[model samples]
Target: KGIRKVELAVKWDPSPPGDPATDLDIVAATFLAGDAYGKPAYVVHFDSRSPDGTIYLNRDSKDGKGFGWDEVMTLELNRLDSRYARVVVGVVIQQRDAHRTFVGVLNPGLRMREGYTVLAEDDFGGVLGSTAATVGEFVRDDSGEWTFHPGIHGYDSDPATFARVMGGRQ
Candidate 1:
């Protein structure tokens, strides 16, 4: 039995009083097996969800005012369509005011877990200079079992651009 249902969470401290809210978002892109390295079949974020409702953001924070994780997304891989061969999860800072990067956010943390077992976690320290960074990816093997590959790749694109190419050949 591989990962069935996993939760992706991110947290960050509120910006110093008066500073613009450090809004961060979690994004997931689904790719078809036939075109795994090309464009994603669909993307999920704060305002979107998978067509079958298998992936979505459970919590969203605009200013890191939440208690624990500022943004939370759930991936029910067991229930997802087999047509989706890959899913990549990423974190991007909203470039509304300043060209903020992970370094600009205070105490930023990210985690991926199934129930109480954490599979991966980070403080966004590796991608401090990037406006967005892909945390990792889930891929389905020929045996139909899902497995996770953990990595951190930084990117300078905005939210939309990040989503489009985060899972592309790298």
Candidate 2:
């Protein structure tokens, strides 16, 4: 069957012991023309949105919370513009320059889902020491069905420079 729409969802707890000391950012990296295969044409994070607004960041939970996943990012993978082909989702520790990492965030975890089925899930320590992790990628196929490849890659770079990269396992 042809795909109509696909929602790429992610959740994470925002509360950390350091409070103001630690900050985490969920990012959706979109790749377009004039960019490398794995590099983002533009990034959608706390302050940015996809050019067409189809990709959305539901919320930016700054303070750590005790409840369930307090943050989310949704992407219309099936409705993606033909001009773009790659969609990469990941998390970055905003203050990694000051020793902040996923390890610093309280109960930091991630899971990606399409409809009711979870494609992948993992914890922050999976990428310990790295300020960022390129979790997975959704690449549109010739048939218009976007495929999800699960992955986990640790990056020692900061949230600034660490983004704009891709999950190499694809």
Candidate 3:
């Protein structure tokens, strides 16, 4: 119904920063109204934006610094296209070959918020043993209201794999 933002924030032991897979990135996939396999309409990431630029990814939090990359992405719903139906957001770890993913220790978390209100929040503790995950998805209803579905799905699937299936379910 209004503007929304998904903040991908991570914090870990700064003592040992040797994990190359420590990089945290957020991705947004746009799809048709009801079709998940319709080529995703479009995709957004660190270096890319939607065709209309309604969704923009700010920066990457590669060092696990506290509160860094707080708002990695901001989606202006009111500025989005009418043809766009679903926007799926994901959190992924790099260096998949090394076999590593996020495992928050104390206060690390991910939160989607609207203005001063939080829509959803989650810690990566239950999100262990995988290299990536589908954080959530927002869909546009028939009445033209945006609904957030915080569906978290872990993935053993490689980077390029999930990167390609932007809109399709893994």
Candidate 4:
């Protein structure tokens, strides 16, 4: 069976004492079947949800002060519409106070899971210079089934640009 309902979580230690807060956000963008590399049909982040509720942001952390995951997002692949052919998930670090990167966030961690099985996990160690990173994606096959594709692609651009082009060919 392919992936059904999945959870994406990100965690990191708070910025060193007295430093500006480290804010990381989980972002998911849905693309139409005919325009997989074009603009997304919809995007969901900290304060948003898929139009039909198939994807949503469950938790939001501004300073990584939480014990477990700092940000949590749930994607119900089985519930997604057939019109959606692709779903890209990524992590973006806010750059309000200063230019931030994976190396700047202390011990940042990420996990993608479905039920008892963990699909993917990362410590963001490989892409320490990027401000954002695409974690994985869900592709809808011709048979109408959903499959998970795991890979990490880092971006040096800002969060908005990362959200817009994360699903596109790199």
In model 1, where do residues sit more than 4 Å from their true spots?
none
Clashing pairs in 4: none
Weakest lDDT window of 10 consecutive positions for candidate 2:
1-10
lDDT of 4 at 27: 98
Question: What are the models' TM-scores?
Answer: 0.96, 0.83, 0.81, 0.96
TM-score, cand. 2? 0.83
**Model 1: lowest-lDDT 10 consecutive positions:** 161-170
- By lDDT, the better pick of 1 and 2 is 1
CA lDDT scores, all candidates in order: 0.90, 0.68, 0.66, 0.90
**Model 4 TM-score on a 0 to 1 scale:** 0.96
**Clash number by candidate, in order:** 0, 3, 1, 0
C-alpha root-mean-square deviation, each candidate = 1.1, 2.9, 3.0, 1.1
- The lowest-lDDT stretch of 10 consecutive residues in candidate 3 is 6-15
TM-score pick, better of 1 and 2: 1
Model 1's alpha-carbon lDDT is 0.90
Candidate 4 minimal-lDDT segment of 10 residues: 161-170
lDDT of 4 at 10: 96
Over the stretch 1-170, how does candidate 2's per-residue lDDT look in tens digits? 23334444344555535556556778878776344275577788888878888788887666645366657788877667877877778877777336766676666777777676677778766777777888877777667777776787888777777664553334
